[PDB]
């Protein structure tokens, strides 16, 4: 009942949710179901990337920039 209304991505199960969606898409032989699962996985990946960018906007990104320019 809690997970019914509580949306899935929050918060640490992003990788687990993506793996479950990928497994469901692989198991499902249908076309519409596979497309929906792929779209959901892409949306989850984009959300995770945006969250990481927001969190890693400073320091975590500047360090990568300095490392690449130094190499």
């Amino acid at each position: 009942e809690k997970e019914r209304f509580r949306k899935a991505p929050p918060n640490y199960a992003m990788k687990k949710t993506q793996l479950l969606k990928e497994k469901a898409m692989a198991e499902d032989l249908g076309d519409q179901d596979k497309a929906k699962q792929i779209q959901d996985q892409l949306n989850e990946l984009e959300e995770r990337a945006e969250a990481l960018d927001r969190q890693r906007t400073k320091n975590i990104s500047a360090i990568s920039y300095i490392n690449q320019r130094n190499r």
């Binding site: 969250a51 927001r54 969190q55 906007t57 400073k58 320091n59 975590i60």
Partner: protein, 258 residues
Amino acid sequence: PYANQPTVRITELTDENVKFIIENTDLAVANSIRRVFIAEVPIIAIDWVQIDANSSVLHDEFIAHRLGLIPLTSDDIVDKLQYSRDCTCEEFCPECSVEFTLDVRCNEDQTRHVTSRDLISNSPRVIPVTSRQDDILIVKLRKGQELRLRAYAKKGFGKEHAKWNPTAGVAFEYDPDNALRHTVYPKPEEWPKSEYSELDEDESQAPYDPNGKPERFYYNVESCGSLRPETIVLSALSGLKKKLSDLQTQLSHEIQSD
């Protein structure tokens, strides 16, 4: 059968280090003054940290370790406070200690940089080196973590721990030209000239000098930021004088008792 009349001359006076020269003194006194500069110099520092909630990734003791190494300015406070060991009360009284507090919690999305600026001190003059150049980074927190604690500062000297070591590095050097032959260079031509060397670029080292005592000791006391260099020198001299006075008093009492 008495002491000598040493002379002093400052060559560079700044707010980070001083380069003075002491002439007409024995080597033992100079070396002792150096070791006092490094070891026996009263200064305030963090020595008692009470951690209430530390959700960071580092160890619980890591926070205390880093906080112990954060310098604190004590230009006019070290001479007033007394050693906690010789206190005549209970709990860290402000008359013999300084209280600190740190309460930071990363709420926004970006990662926090908990610096020394977060140390809110109760006293105005006892603050980390942030008056007048980034601040000492303590730890990095991320959304969801926190670091709440309060610590107290006390007076101590380097002989007890490195936290009470104001001087960064003392450049003690005497007799730039190897005149007293205290060191024998196998190939003098292969060595560079000292910064204080008066010898020309032709000759490698000054000639031998049988009847010659070490004089003109050079110093480069470098303050870490807590105590001023000249203040460090004055405190060291006062402490050495106090130690000699106490030794003399003890010797007099021992002789009288016998």
